[PDB]
Paper text:
Omi-12, the most potent of the set of 28, belongs to the IGHV1-58 gene family, which has been isolated on several occasions following SARS-CoV-2 infection. It is anomalous in that it cross-neutralizes all VoC whilst other IGHV1-58 antibodies lose activity against BA.1, and this potency is recovered by somatic mutation. In a set of potent early pandemic antibodies, the IGHV1-58 gene family was the second most highly represented (4/20) (Dejnirattisai et al., 2021a); however, they constitute only 1/28 in the Omicron set, and it is notable that other IGHV1-58 antibodies such as AZD8895 and representatives from our previous studies such as mAbs 55, 165, 253, and Beta-47 show large or complete loss of neutralization activity against Omicron BA.1 (Dejnirattisai et al., 2021a). Omi-2 belongs to the IGHV1-69 gene family but has features in common with Omi-12, the only member of the IGHV1-58 gene family found in the set of 28 potent antibodies.
S is the major surface glycoprotein on the SARS-CoV-2 virion and is involved in viral attachment to target cells via the interaction of cell-surface-expressed angiotensin-converting enzyme 2 (ACE2) with the receptor binding site, at the tip of the receptor binding domain (RBD), in the S1 fragment of S (Lan et al., 2020). Following attachment, cleavage of S releases S1, allowing a major conformational change in S2, exposing a hydrophobic loop that executes fusion of viral and host cell membranes, releasing the viral genome to initiate viral replication (Walls et al., 2017). In-depth structure-and-function analyses of 27 potent RBD-binding mAbs isolated from vaccinated volunteers following breakthrough Omicron-BA.1 infection reveals that they are focused in two main clusters within the RBD, with potent right-shoulder antibodies showing increased prevalence. In summary, we have presented a structure-function analysis of potent human antibodies induced by Omicron BA.1 breakthrough infection in SARS-CoV-2 vaccinated individuals.
Author numbering:
A (entry chain L): 1 to 212
B (entry chain H): 1 to 224
The structure:
Amino acid sequence: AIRMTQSPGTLSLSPGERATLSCRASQSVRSSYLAWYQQKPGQAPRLLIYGASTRATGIPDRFSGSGSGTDFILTINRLEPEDLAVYYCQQFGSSPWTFGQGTKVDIKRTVAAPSVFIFPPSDEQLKSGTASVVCLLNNFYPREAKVQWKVDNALQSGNSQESVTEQDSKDSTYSLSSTLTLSKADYEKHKVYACEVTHQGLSSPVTKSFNR
Amino acid sequence: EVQLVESGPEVKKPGTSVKVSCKASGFSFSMSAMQWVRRARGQRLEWIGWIVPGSGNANYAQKFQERVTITRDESTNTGYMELSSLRSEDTAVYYCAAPHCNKTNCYDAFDIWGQGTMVTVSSASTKGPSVFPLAPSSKSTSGGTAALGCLVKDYFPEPVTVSWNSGALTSGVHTFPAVLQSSGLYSLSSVVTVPSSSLGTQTYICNVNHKPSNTKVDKRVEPK
Ligand SMILES: *[C@@H]1O[C@H](CO)[C@@H](O)[C@H](O)[C@H]1NC(C)=O
């Protein structure tokens, strides 16, 4: 089987810069049977370049394919924030039609501090015997952000779970969602529920809290 | 519209068989080849096999040669991919691709792709989600904008679909990826930022669909 190796695994570039992606096969593949695909978050793959250097229909002219034999190149002349995705190359002239491991393209941008919002558990959930307190960090960059929970000035650890969206295709920011899970009994015993947020865009940690 | 529409999500016990559908629209289906590719959560694409147009002549990768059968039906314009002897490592999103064709000519590569079918293999039973409101308040307002959302909690398996106001609301929506809770069930939250002055005169409804459990819930989020 023909092995397809893409490099680098991840490429973080500023918008407007030129992206360069490598695709290499363990043996020579015919150029008319090498394709490039673009898979954006939550979307099916999209054919970018086929025949090594032929742009598919609807593909902007800033995408460019080149190479032959065992070394193929994808070039994005001016990178746009919408171009963030995983880019796969595939050979389909020799079975099995193997894929590469793909190259993830991130977008760089200025530091952006998050907007912090907290949500108390709903009375409908409290009827079920459980309580979920949600902390929302909205539209920030870079992705690194620290979220700590405090319940009556008691640091919570091991009972919260976080989740980060993929990078936004327009403003290139991230959004995080942390969920604190407590029993209805434990939730009714305490008053001050707070999530503290540490991030590069903040001069000092920001705390959002509410009283039960 | 040149389209490739696959079937819905699946839950299959280990050792059972799944058969994913892939119906075509817009182009001549009989003239079109079809390849099948899967991708596990957070991995690379894996080629399964392909089938030539007209006949049932198929070709598979050595990994799936023994238990994958790729077929096609010209009368109903639908190609199928049946994977038997399902095990844990088969949990992935399965895609079908095809070149578009008219009555005589075809594209030289695979440009038409299906939306993907998520198949999950586990002994765990299916469970529908509970939708709770993330109501907006003074503690979720900054500037002139407020945040509200929906907590889609305790469901299995993946995935769930969340839209707002039947798809009329897209600007400012963030549907976070699910987390696997210690109970074995998933939990997801979708939020949206709206201007504060709209909370009183505009209704906000999150539309939650969990196809594996046939659970559709329209939860209205009201201010607290
Ligand atoms: C099929 O499409 C090709 C373009 O790829 C065109 O030249 C040809 O006339 C079309 N034939 C029919 C019957 O639609």
